[PDB]
Design a protein around this ligand. Structure first.
Ligand SMILES: CCCCCCCCCCCCCCCCCC(=O)OC[C@H](COP(=O)(O)OC[C@H](N)C(=O)O)OC(=O)CCCCCCCCCCCCCCCCC
Ligand SMILES: CCCCCCCCCCCCCCCCCC(=O)OC[C@H](COP(=O)(O)OC[C@H](N)C(=O)O)OC(=O)CCCCCCCCCCCCCCCCC
Length: 577
């Protein structure tokens, strides 16, 4: 207990200070002073100016806060109790939990706990991108959803154009913390009962500042993790190691999952956002995806990556700005929505991503675009971060458990892809379904002969098929307009146009079979290039070289059987004679 108190002390003080909220209405003593002190301490910790370099000043400021609280001190039956408890807690933390805390800040379960803690800390530190990603998710899914307005666009923009540029990431994070503190102050200011009628607070439960508090808590947790990693670091290959057992391969993928499949995952996330949003902006996304994908060689992808990333981040910023525009203070309306008889209506203004007060554009899909941005930034980092033919004969045959998986992946997956293509084609009625069915049929008929072909024609035909699939994706995205904007009019005019395509409105979901088909096709395209498949193709060629002997052996067996029967009949007839 003494060690726990000496170690985990400041957290109790922070919790006690935070517990001072919901003190009826807004009182400067209740919030302003305490909230300002907590914000100053948190900002000092984030910037490491005092709370991580002059913690004596931190203790002095804690003592000063306790003195101010004392100077400040059923109406007062319970209100006079929380300040006393907070003062007592601060005095206790300053009595014994101050010097040992500063010093520390400068049974088979034991081994398991040690291993779990070491793995978690190593992951948080080395794979700091994961932490950054969690903080980004908590800073985007809240600002873009809860309070979509000014005073939250600054932090969103800062992080959005900090993620693809890690050189700006550290200071930007600190700036975000400062901005969060400012937002918190605003949330504390607007909660007062002195308003009486951008980004108004309108505090209902006075739970209306939980977003900024959670963002600050996540930032503090990330900073604490980084500081602990630095303290541990100051104190106290894999590819060849792949082919021993399943555990080694699992650990190797845990290490370098993104390094090899980042482009595939980014394409999959682009398809996912395309499916989820389904608008004109998505038409732009699809056009740019085909533009990148047309250049087949990876070096062209390297050349065109920075343009992709910059275009996508500026597109995200434009989307967020377009979400919040023309504040309702000026009662004038947008240059489109008049009382005129212009052909546009509510359906088209919903489809076309435009700001309208009657139907504000959705703000729970920017998350998918931001995830795509994160994938693109990680892949840009990977791009900037730049014998087996002996083993592969030995996985052509079976060993402990890695060989079975290798043969099931590099040999028995070319047919699962065809099965998935057939299922996708036959599970939804359209012209695209017929095209998928015909492609699957042709591939299945000419499977083995295609496998034994050289890599060139194989990649040519595979790229043709995947480009047809992405063309189908973009065509469905295009026709979603006529599927939703002009449902009744087109239905009355023509019902066969609704027959030939899936005209239902989508509004993970939507094009799911198509997405997995795209995934499997891209995976098989990647497989066709690895060395592992080379000697599987060699085995197929060897099987082709055969088939001049099986017929001979069947004939030999037939001759053996017929001659045995003949001999027994001759014995019988000799007996008869
Ligand atoms: C939400 C919480 C989840 C928590 C999960 C915890 C468990 C999962 C952990 C995830 C795996 C983490 C693996 C990290 C691997 C780091 C590799 C690494 O730093 O590269 C090696 C480093 C740095 O090389 P470089 O300068 O970039 O390039 C050198 C050269 N140019 C080249 O081509 O490269 O150069 C070096 O020489 C340094 C080598 C250091 C290697 C560190 C890893 C050691 C082995 C793996 C340990 C952990 C494995 C996973 C455990 C999983 C447990 C379930
Ligand atoms: C309720 C029903 C549930 C049904 C769920 C079914 C689950 C099925 C899981 C199947 C797992 C297979 C996924 C692995 C993905 C394979 C695709 C892939 O990664 O390509 C292989 C890549 C590409 O080659 P390369 O490393 O770059 O080669 C170096 C160089 N380029 C060269 O070639 O020169 O690099 C590699 O070659 C790496 C090869 C590693 C592949 C290992 C696969 C492990 C499979 C794990 C299956 C475990 C099943 C457990 C069953 C439990 C039952 C209770």
């Amino acid at each position: 207990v003494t060690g726990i108190y000496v170690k985990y002390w400041i957290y109790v003080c922070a919790g006690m200070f935070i517990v001072v909220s919901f003190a009826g209405r807004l009182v400067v003593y209740k919030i302003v002073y305490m909230f300002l002190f907590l914000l100053c301490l948190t900002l000092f910790q984030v910037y490491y100016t005092l709370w991580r370099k002059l913690l004596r000043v931190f203790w002095w400021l804690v003592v000063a806060y306790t003195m101010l609280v004392l100077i400040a001190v059923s109406e007062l039956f319970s209100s006079i109790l929380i300040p006393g408890f907070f003062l007592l807690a601060c005095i206790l933390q300053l009595h014994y939990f101050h010097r040992p805390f500063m010093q520390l800040t400068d049974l088979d379960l034991a081994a398991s706990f040690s291993a779990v803690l070491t793995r978690i800390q190593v992951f948080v530190r080395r794979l700091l991108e994961l932490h950054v990603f969690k903080l980004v998710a908590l800073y985007t899914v809240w600002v873009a959803l809860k309070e979509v307005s000014v005073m939250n666009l600054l932090l969103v923009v800062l992080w959005a154009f900090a993620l693809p540029y890690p050189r700006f990431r550290p200071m930007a994070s600190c700036l975000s913390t400062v901005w969060t503190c400012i937002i918190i102050v605003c949330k504390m200011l607007y909660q007062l009962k002195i308003v009486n009628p951008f980004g108004v607070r309108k505090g209902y439960p006075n739970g209306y500042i939980q977003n900024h508090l959670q963002i600050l808590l996540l930032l503090v947790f990330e900073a604490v993790v980084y500081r602990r990693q630095e303290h541990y670091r100051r104190q106290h290959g894999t590819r060849q190691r792949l082919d021993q057992d399943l555990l080694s391969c699992l650990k190797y993928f845990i290490n370098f999952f993104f390094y090899k499949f980042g482009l595939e995952i980014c394409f999959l996330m682009a398809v996912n956002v395309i499916g989820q949003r389904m608008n004109f902006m998505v038409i732009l996304h699809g056009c740019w995806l085909v533009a990148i994908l047309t250049r087949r060689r990876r070096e062209a992808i390297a050349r065109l990556w920075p343009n992709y990333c910059l275009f996508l981040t500026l597109f995200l910023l434009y989307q967020y700005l377009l979400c919040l525009g023309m504040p309702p203070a000026l009662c004038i309306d947008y240059p489109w929505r008049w009382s005129k008889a212009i052909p546009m209506n509510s359906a088209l203004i919903k489809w076309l991503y435009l700001p309208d007060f009657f139907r504000a554009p959705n703000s729970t899909n920017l998350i998918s675009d931001f995830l795509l941005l994160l994938c693109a930034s990680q892949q840009w980092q990977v791009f900037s971060a730049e014998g087996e033919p002996n083993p592969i004969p030995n996985f052509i045959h079976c060993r402990s458990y890695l060989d079975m998986l290798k043969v099931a992946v590099f040999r028995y997956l070319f047919w699962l892809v065809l099965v998935v293509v057939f299922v996708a084609g036959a599970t939804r009625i359209s012209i695209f379904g017929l095209g998928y069915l015909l492609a699957c049929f042709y591939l299945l008929l000419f499977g083995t002969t295609l496998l034994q072909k050289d890599t060139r024609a194989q990649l040519v035909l595979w790229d043709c098929l995947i480009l047809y699939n992405v063309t189908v994706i973009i065509s469905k995205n295009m026709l979603s307009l006529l599927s939703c904007v002009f449902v009744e009019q087109m239905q009355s005019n023509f019902c066969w146009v609704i027959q030939l395509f899936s005209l239902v409105c989508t509004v993970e979901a939507g094009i799911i079979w198509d997405s997995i088909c795209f995934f499997f096709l891209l995976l098989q395209r990647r497989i066709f290039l690895s060395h592992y498949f080379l000697h599987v193709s060699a085995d197929l060629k060897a099987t082709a070289l055969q088939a001049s002997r099986g017929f001979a052996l069947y004939n030999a067996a037939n001759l053996k059987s017929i001659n045995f029967h003949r001999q027994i009949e001759e014995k019988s007839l000799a007996q008869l004679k």
